[PDB]
Amino acid sequence: PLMGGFGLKHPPPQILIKNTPVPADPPTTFSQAKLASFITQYSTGQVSVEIEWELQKENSKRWNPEIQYTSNYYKSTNVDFAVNTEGTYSEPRPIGTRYLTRNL
Amino acid sequence: PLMGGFGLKHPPPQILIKNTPVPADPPTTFSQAKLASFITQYSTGQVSVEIEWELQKENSKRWNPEIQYTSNYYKSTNVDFAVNTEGTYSEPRPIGTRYLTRNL
């Protein structure tokens, strides 16, 4: 992909879900038309997903230290990647995936 | 220890080594005195040492990133922990052992 990530020829299927429509009380006398009324409705539940990942271990002889992604040492108003006063979770900056080095 | 490290009641033994003294030519007529002359000498070789270490894996639920020891991202005159122009190896700063965090 241009956005990055993995291209796949058989991606994970997409799950589709809908409330089963519940019609309100239809009239007594038959009517040819389809039922235009329904009971306002919504549903809630829990969903769980796991992904088993495979890693390629980093095996390298570079003498000096590498570069690593690390949180700031210095004080700040409030913790990054954590909630704020009013409870709004916030992530300050994007995280690149490339730090460790490899000989071309 | 106060310097840090591990205290031990049976530390690794200390290896001691010496050139076996080689006397120069003593006189023909016997002499009571011990031999005061020797052949100037030195020896060279290779030494190898390995240490099998045990680690306590870090298992922790902290949500936000930790602090990590990482080399500078920004450019510098020359690489740290690596040789300089004239070939003098140099280590810029001490390295503490404590970064990862643990709930007291």
Automatic annotation (TrEMBL), chains A, B:
Where is the protein localized? Answer: Virion
Recorded family membership: Belongs to the parvoviridae capsid protein family.
Return the protein name: Capsid protein VP1
Organism of provenance: Adeno-associated virus
